[PDB]
């Protein structure tokens, strides 16, 4: 599915990123949307043969496994698969691993690119 902005936001309140290791809730929707626009399904390879899966483009290098990614870790014990559901579960859990690694959210590329260092609060902003 591709949420709405305020849509998501309410979700991602509802599973506790709101705050979270630090982290207001308009940075996370701000890297949802320049992670993966919304989309639940969003999936991009990269050079090291990973890829990166779902809402949050969480990469199976380090994160989740996709059985097909050389030097898996999967230090979120989960299957990549997992993270292409509708529902946001699976991927909130990872993301909340990920922030809680020693690098913030600079694991998001995007949001470190495109969100870090704006008014991220816009992102929540009338819902
Ligand atoms: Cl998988």
Not at 39 to 47: G, S
Not at 65 to 90: F, Q, Y
Request: glycine residues 10%.
């Amino acid at each position: 599915k591709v949420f709405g902005r305020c849509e998501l936001a309410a979700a991602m309140k509802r599973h506790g990123l709101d705050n979270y290791r630090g982290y207001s809730l308009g940075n996370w929707v701000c890297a949802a949307k320049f992670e993966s626009n919304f989309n639940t399904q969003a999936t991009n390879r990269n050079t090291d043969g990973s890829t990166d899966y779902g809402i949050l483009q969480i990469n199976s290098r380090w994160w989740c496994n996709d059985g097909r990614t050389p030097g898996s870790r999967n230090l979120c014990n989960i299957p990549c698969s997992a993270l292409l559901s509708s529902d946001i579960t699976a991927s909130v859990n990872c993301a909340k691993k990920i922030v809680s690694d020693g690098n913030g959210m600079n694991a998001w590329v995007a949001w470190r690119n495109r969100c870090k260092g704006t008014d991220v609060q816009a992102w929540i902003r009338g819902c």
